[PDB]
């Protein structure tokens, strides 16, 4: 309840999944937790919920939006520690002549320019608290997955992005790291298991993706970031595995030497 | 003179630098290859320098001169067995105040998103030669660099969808490669020091970032090219490191634990 | 103060160092803490500072001595949560013709197989308590060190063995992971320094090899030990770096591409 | 027939699976080719169908047996361009606790210490002639494999290694790489899927582990050899992974987030 008491958090994408095991992650360790969400209905039930935590709506694809959820930060609470850069989306699975251009930019604009926005303008108040960066990227950016062409580019931009930044911030004192999950269980990855054939076929074999046996919950990704914020003061351009090892050993990956 | 006798290749940007290097290998190992690039000057003389290679001019931002590029190299040459996504330029040094989401977009085009759509539209043709894709990205990708948060977010990119891409194409048999150099003695790198306070001593400093003590050549991202196409038939999704061993232990990073 | 209470944790190499900062973040979690070390007087020291801290003298390249650590922890605190595989050493360095290959065997004894034997041990105990393994590695097993051939093959068998263990271990629900270390300013540090030509200048070139300009701190290896026993259920199998970003971008690794 | 002509290899464990197909690559290459085994039958037969390549009787774990492999290959020949560090074994599958250290301590002296005598025994010669060394590694050095704790460490250890000697070896010019190979179908793998309780059902688990959907043949194997040695002159430290893509993707790691 006090490791990262009197710091002020940015979650973008905080109304619901990761983003609100996040949220609550911070407001558990005493922190004030600005809810950035394009919808309105889970982080304002959140503000509600959670003293400590408000709701600013805000598409992170709109630079003026952007620039008034770090206005109104800093207005209302008077300094600025941490962005948390959790704001994205994973497409349906489209083989890659199912792709377009013109869908690939619009999914760099959420997953990779949010991103790059709202840590353009949190920078300079960071820099005043020694604050960091924490941006939410995937382990698929770093392994690949099936289906899924433009979604892993994003990703894999994300996770480089980090350590460019980490380089370029480390003078002022300024940490940038990422979390890459793998299988998290929220709202998207049951969304995206319904479009599937067979539902509760495809959940089961991504529970079974990970040695563990089981998907990640969205409290296990808050409390790496709070981690990385609040005790990792030598941590900065790592990119921190939530993934219940789905990335070790040997599994099916087709459906003897030629 | 005949490791890849009999093959197309198309290699982007090939009119100078580490593609006319690429371009230089694959004719040295007995293929056809079509030079693209948007810059006339380079590409036309080495067409008339190499029996083997031919130019066409194609600015691989432009998606119609993408298409009409694979069509003119079917009509032209009757197969494509290999695509090499070399096109891509590094800005000169910015910090990332000094950025902007609009140059990001741009740099985001030409050194992601040309690379995606010639792969997009070559590989219906891949897929009859059981063909391969080599896209050219870079350490800095893996690593990061400073001054560079764009350039490394894109090269972060296009390692990635390498990887997913091979996951894709691989029940057909098509390969998806990448090479990631290092520091390679170019007109581009040649350009960037130019800009410096000290041109002279950015060259000797890009020396000694490798424990080798020298940049690498044109040449030697070309022969990991040809490797790659004509004899890794059990490699795909690889990041093929050409970097002298830059990434190798501890170097000068910062300009006694507090 | 309660994030680790109740639990029972087991520190090798605790004496001193990044063991005992090691030691002092589980006591501050709420943890008793078992001190293995071969030296008396930094663990004996310990035990009188710390209350929930006790001193077991134990050479982890001695079967038998590990064999009596494990059954007087359990007898003295009736479980066991955790092993931290700390204690290890580094040679001066040695160029490769001045290396043997009886001096690989003993640091392979130290370095890998009383972490080996150890968590042999102690996965019973660990199994019951449904506990955790975390092996203190170093980034040289990852990105290589010059003049430390022995050193880097131990620890690049640490991080490798790490994975291994946690996939064989992942059905019973006990995690295994690595901490990867950079330069931590350490009394290992300082006497190394003092073996040089000129101790004060590779102190300053081992704070710069960070690019945030400092070595880090054992206290921050212990915050990112308490992180992985006690707030990261879902990581197994991962190499959390603690390296101050030496890793990220090009340095100097040598004493235009000729 | 002529990119390693008028070379010199010696290829350990070149009697049979990968290392012939090594020794094949090298002959095919132009070069003339010193097989070491502990074994006659593979290995004299293949000097007598190879004109090039000749046998010599030779156990890795044994230093003067070594010590006379490097004496005769330069009394016969007169110069030493590559060594490849082939010889290895992979036990049965063995759960951590069934595993002990003195069988630990006798599959590191093959993996890793016979591997590093070879190496120490050899660089005198590869500095005069600029040559290089290439490491055997494993795929499951870097992602680890179940039931294999001991084997997945020792190739942990060649990986890291392989990198620190690159960087010491760098001011000489001599270079130092690692292959990486994934699932190749040799006499060994036949020989572990034998001792399963359905080698059929392991054999064609094997082969669906690769999102190529087959094993990796030691020609394959024995090309990436040929590359590194003849072709890869700004490769320094590098690990060529030859596993078919098995390191991507997600895939069936155990046998929704509680
Ligand atoms: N769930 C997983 O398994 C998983 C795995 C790896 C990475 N991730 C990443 O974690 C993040 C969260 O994923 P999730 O599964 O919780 O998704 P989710 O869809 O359940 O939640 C995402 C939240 O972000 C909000 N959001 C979307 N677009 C936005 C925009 N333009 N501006 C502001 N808010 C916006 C949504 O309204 C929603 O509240 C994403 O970056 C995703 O790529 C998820
Ligand atoms: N030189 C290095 O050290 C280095 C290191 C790592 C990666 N790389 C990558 O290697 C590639 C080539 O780099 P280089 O140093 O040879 O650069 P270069 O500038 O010398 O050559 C690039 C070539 O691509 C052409 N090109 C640029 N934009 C194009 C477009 N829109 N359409 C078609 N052609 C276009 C240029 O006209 C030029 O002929 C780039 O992708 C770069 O990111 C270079
Ligand atoms: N200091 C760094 O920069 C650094 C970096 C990366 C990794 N590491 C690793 O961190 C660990 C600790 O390093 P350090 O710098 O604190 O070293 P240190 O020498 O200061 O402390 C190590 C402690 O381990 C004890 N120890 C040594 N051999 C032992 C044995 N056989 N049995 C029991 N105890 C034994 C020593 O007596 C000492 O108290 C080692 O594994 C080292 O490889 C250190
Ligand atoms: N087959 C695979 O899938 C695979 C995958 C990854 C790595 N590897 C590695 O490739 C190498 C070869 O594997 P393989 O499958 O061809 O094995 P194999 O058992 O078929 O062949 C190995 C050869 O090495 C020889 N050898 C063994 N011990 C020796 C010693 N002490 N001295 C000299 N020669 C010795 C054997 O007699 C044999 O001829 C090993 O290092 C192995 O770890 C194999
Ligand atoms: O891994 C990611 O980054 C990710 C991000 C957001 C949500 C879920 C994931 C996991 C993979 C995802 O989950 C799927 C379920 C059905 C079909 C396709 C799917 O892909
Ligand atoms: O690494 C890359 O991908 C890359 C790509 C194209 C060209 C050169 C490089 C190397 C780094 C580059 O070279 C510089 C020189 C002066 C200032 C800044 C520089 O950055
Ligand atoms: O990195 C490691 O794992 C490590 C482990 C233990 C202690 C120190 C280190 C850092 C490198 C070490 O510090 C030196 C100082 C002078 C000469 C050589 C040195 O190497
Ligand atoms: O991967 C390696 O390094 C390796 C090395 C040598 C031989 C084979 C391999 C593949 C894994 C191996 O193949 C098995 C088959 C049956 C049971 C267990 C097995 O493990
Ligand atoms: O919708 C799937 C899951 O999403 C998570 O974000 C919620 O915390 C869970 O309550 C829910 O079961
Ligand atoms: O301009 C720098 C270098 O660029 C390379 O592409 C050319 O092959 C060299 O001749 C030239 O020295
Ligand atoms: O000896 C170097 C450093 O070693 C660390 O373990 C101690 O905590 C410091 O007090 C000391 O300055
Ligand atoms: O024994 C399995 C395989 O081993 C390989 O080394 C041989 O080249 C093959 O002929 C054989 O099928
Ligand atoms: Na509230
Ligand atoms: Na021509
Ligand atoms: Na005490
Ligand atoms: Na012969």
Known sequence: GTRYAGK????????????????????????????????????????????????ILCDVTQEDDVKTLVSETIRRFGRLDCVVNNAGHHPPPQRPEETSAQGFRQLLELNLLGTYTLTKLALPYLRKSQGNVINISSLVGAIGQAQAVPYVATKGAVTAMTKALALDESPYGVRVNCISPGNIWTPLWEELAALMPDPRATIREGMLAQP????????????????????????????????????????????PDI
Do not use: H, W
Request: proline share 2%; glycine share 20%; with cysteine.
């Open 212 to 255: 563990l046996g089981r998907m990640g919950q969205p409290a296990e990704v808050g409390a790496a970031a709070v981690f990385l914020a609040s005790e990792a003061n030598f941590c900065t351009g790592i990119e921190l595995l939530v993934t219940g090892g789905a990335e070790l050993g040997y599994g099916c990956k087709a459906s």
């Open 8 to 55: 002020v958090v940015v979650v973008t994408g905080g109304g619901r999944g990761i983003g609100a095991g996040i949220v609550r992650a911070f407001v558990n360790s005493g922190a004030r937790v600005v809810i950035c969400d394009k919808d309105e209905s889970g982080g304002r039930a959140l503000e509600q919920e959670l003293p400590g935590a408000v709701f």
